[PDB]
Amino acid sequence: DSSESCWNCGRKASETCSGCNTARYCGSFCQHKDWEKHHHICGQTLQAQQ
Ligand SMILES: [Zn+2]
Ligand SMILES: [Zn+2]
């Protein structure tokens, strides 16, 4: 676990998952690339989609 780094790039991240406020990324593309994997642990905080 790096200090404020992109979950994919490994360099640096500025954006944060708006759905869980946890995941961090440097861009929209990075979020989409990891998004597929992200759904494995995302969507279990608010529980709206059901
Ligand atoms: Zn990135
Ligand atoms: Zn998320």
Side-chain angles (χ1 to χ4, degrees):
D1 220 50
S2 337
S3 236
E4 193 239 330
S5 195
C6 192
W7 289 36
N8 164 76
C9 288
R11 207 281 124 79
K12 205 221 205 212
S14 287
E15 310 201 21
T16 302
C17 187
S18 29
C20 66
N21 295 282
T22 305
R24 231 131 190 177
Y25 301 97
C26 67
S28 218
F29 65 98
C30 271
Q31 285 156 279
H32 293 150
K33 296 280 159 89
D34 287 48
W35 149 230
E36 194 97 65
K37 299 104 227 266
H38 200 32
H39 65 44
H40 278 300
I41 61 103
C42 198
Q44 306 254 54
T45 71
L46 210 72
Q47 279 291 336
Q49 58 185 35
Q50 269 163 331

